[PDB]
Amino acid sequence: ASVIEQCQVVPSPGSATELTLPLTYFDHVWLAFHRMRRILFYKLPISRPDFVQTIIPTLKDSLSLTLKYYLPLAGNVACPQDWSGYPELRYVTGNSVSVIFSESDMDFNYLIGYHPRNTKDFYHFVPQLAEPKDAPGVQLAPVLAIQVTLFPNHGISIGFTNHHVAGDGATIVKFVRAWALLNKFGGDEQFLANEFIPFYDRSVIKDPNGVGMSIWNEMKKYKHMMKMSDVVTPPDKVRGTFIITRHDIGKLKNLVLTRRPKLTHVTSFTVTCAYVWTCIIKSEAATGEEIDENGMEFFGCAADCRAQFNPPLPPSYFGNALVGYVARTRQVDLAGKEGFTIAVELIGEAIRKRMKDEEWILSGSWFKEYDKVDAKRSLSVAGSPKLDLYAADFGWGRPEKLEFVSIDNDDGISMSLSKSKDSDGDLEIGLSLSKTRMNAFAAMFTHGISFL
Amino acid sequence: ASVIEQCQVVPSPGSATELTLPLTYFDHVWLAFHRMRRILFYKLPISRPDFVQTIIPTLKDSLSLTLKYYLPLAGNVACPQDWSGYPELRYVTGNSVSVIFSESDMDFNYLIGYHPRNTKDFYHFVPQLAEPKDAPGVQLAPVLAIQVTLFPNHGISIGFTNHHVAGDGATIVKFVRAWALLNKFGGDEQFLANEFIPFYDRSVIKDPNGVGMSIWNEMKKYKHMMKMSDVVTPPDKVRGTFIITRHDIGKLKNLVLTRRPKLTHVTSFTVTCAYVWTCIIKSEAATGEEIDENGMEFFGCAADCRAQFNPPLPPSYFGNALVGYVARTRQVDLAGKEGFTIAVELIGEAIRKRMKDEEWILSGSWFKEYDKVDAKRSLSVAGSPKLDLYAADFGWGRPEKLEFVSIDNDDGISMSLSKSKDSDGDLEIGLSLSKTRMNAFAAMFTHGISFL
């Protein structure tokens, strides 16, 4: 149910008029990627009246204020039509962010549970995101849209939809964080920490090998691959959160040590993913299935490159700086007894390999050449322990539940990962699966840990 | 394919002519129970000729010799037709054991694997067991039948079918053991250990409370319940062995100690069953299922009573001396995280309760009154770690694989348990399940231990 659309939410008075940003080679690939959807739920004893009275005006302000900092987010990513080259992120005085305030009679308490919940109901709280308009010899595409949604008496949700080409994940979260700060302290910029102020000037993304060009004036020939429209198809899968616990991580690390006592790279992340990985693989057998126990199996994830020789890139640099790491193995051994130990070996050495490896980013940019993986047989991680979007206090306190809605659309299994709401060192795992798989998996997760 | 039936295999020259044994209250209940089927496989480079030349005559001898000791096994259990009372085990000079030697072109190596195997193919190697004949005012039923089966070039199987009213499990295994000894040493009785010589005279089964009568002249009214005929229906389920390992048991015991550091009763048996129990319960959820997480769940098993104040019953006493122990709990908690710990608590205290408790056997014989359990929602254990039927060396060495075929027919989940073939302290778990359940379970078993 719709309350008021602010088709416009322009950046605050003091904002610049020109901001156009040509895409780094980091940005290019995301053009062929679907859009990102996150929701934040906030438990509140809020009435409708004062949602309209307060929440709207105050959010409306604090937002525009935010955008004066995170300017491209009102912008539009320009996409070249002929073989002229250079996609830019463009912002011009006039264009703005679409936000919708809606009200909803759905069970809040249900939605914010950790128990598996019908995946299709989360699309109601994430904005749909406008259709492409035209400029000369180019076409523009909205980069961000917000839905704020009241649950009379229980809380507010805040949905976000955005193009990965603009954002980063690291970059988008900084932005929410900052918007929250700005609302929380009623737009006193003296509260906006250095860390939440974006750093724009590119070229600090040095590119000697002309890969920004190369990695593009070649994609430039497959535009049907780069869907410019945001087309959402909610699937019937099921979405549930899993909490692996400070202690339990410890126990896992402990297990590794004992068994394979080499290995420098045994971090929380890598035990966690390694654990999930084996549960996925193991839980599949459980659901009566024809599976090639001999076929290869993949795990992948995106780094964040800002730590990079030269001087490590300013931790506020705006675009994308993701690079993918991939692990691989036959299912046979991943499903057999020393599977978790092997999982940790692989995932770990996937990272320990291409770390301070600047060459492989800039040169041998066949970082863009990890294209012999079976998307269908793989496991992709979304977030990062580092990213604490649970810190996004808007004034109504921290959130009750996070949902990374766009882990759904992936062609073969994707998992969210963030810090717990609650206990310092615990982690949240998000998953989106067929109800029977989900059942299978929830039982494997819960079984292994209980022997730890 | 049939080679030669010895419709007769009478006991050796020196045998007694009269042996009739009235049933203890231990024996009565087994009248309403289906028959027991076990197979032993022996890996051998054996040709057909010398199977006929040697194996047959030699087995044929050693067997009759054995039966001169274990006499009732040629007998017939008499079943009263009018309300006169007293079922007896009867043997008379003349009656004998039916044995069949057959040959088979099925893959031996397949059958003796631990991998799940089509349950229906094991009925080919266990004898069918004759139809009831008549005596005046009574009807007789064969108590035992043997099938010996050649696999040209790979081995011999030895199937057994028998009425639980005669045997015991403890009693039947002693008997195989003894037959093996007798063949192995070419019928030199000086090799037959005191332990393998049955003790017959009852009344050492003291009964002051007249329960032999009571617990019968009441069953005496439901004879359609006591199927006198052996009617076999092979089901399509799947049968696979699981090896929990000396070490792994240790690790489990260790886990208990740490968590619930009270509890005297934490034996291998009770961790093992407790473990399986939780895997059963947990693996059911995995297979997309409607299940009452609030409904009660049972575990049961048969003791062996020979250790019993008076003087503990001669360890060779012939009949049955089984009593059932039952544990119970809601599925909810058995499937949740402290499930295995709770499993051990329950199973353990089920035993630690009615141990040296002679009263509860003789008096309060409402040991026979454990009849509020949901057979459908329960887990029944067959064998015992003690019983080493792997020691049955006939001369061709110890066996390659044991199969307790009659764990199939149970109305809700039954598991075999014996010593490993191989490593001193490891245990074998037998199960018979629907292929999808079986898959589910094999993955749970294998997952939990790998974190141990």
Curated annotation (Swiss-Prot), chains A, B:
Chain positions of motif DFGWG motif: 393-397
Entry's EC annotation: 2.3.1.-, 2.3.1.116
pH dependence, entry free text: Optimum pH is 8.0-8.5.
Lineage: Eukaryota, Viridiplantae, Streptophyta, Embryophyta, Tracheophyta
Name of the protein this chain belongs to: Phenolic glucoside malonyltransferase 1
Any Gene Ontology biological process: response to toxic substance
UniProt cross-references to InterPro entries, sorted A to Z: CAT-like_dom_sf, Plant_metabolite_acyltrans
Catalysed transformations (reactions): a flavonol 3-O-beta-D-glucoside + malonyl-CoA = a flavonol 3-O-(6-O-malonyl-beta-D-glucoside) + CoA; a flavonol 7-O-beta-D-glucoside + malonyl-CoA = a flavonol 7-O-(6-O-malonyl-beta-D-glucoside) + CoA
UniProt entry tagged with the keyword Ribonucleoprotein: no
The entry's keywords: Acyltransferase, Detoxification, Transferase
One Gene Ontology molecular-function label: flavonol-3-O-beta-glucoside O-malonyltransferase activity
Active site: 164 (proton acceptor), 393 (proton acceptor)
Family: Belongs to the plant acyltransferase family. Phenolic glucoside malonyltransferase subfamily.
Provenance organism: Nicotiana tabacum
Residue positions of motif HXXXD motif: 164-168
Dependence of activity on temperature: Stable below 40 degrees Celsius and pH 8.0 for 30 minutes.
Free-text comment on this protein's domains from its UniProt entry: The HXXXXD motif is essential for acyltransferase activity.
Expression sites (tissue/organ): Highly expressed in flower. Also expressed in flower bud, stem, root and leaf.
Subunit structure: Monomer.
Binding residue positions for malonyl-CoA: 253, 265, 267-268
Primary role: Malonyltransferase with broad substrate specificity acting on phenolic glucosides including xenobiotic naphthols. Has activity against flavonoid 7-O-glucosides, flavonoid 3-O-glucosides and naphthol glucosides, and to a lesser extent against coumarin glucosides in vitro. Prefers malonyl-CoA as an acyl donor, but also active with succinyl-CoA and methylmalonyl-CoA, but not with acetyl-CoA.
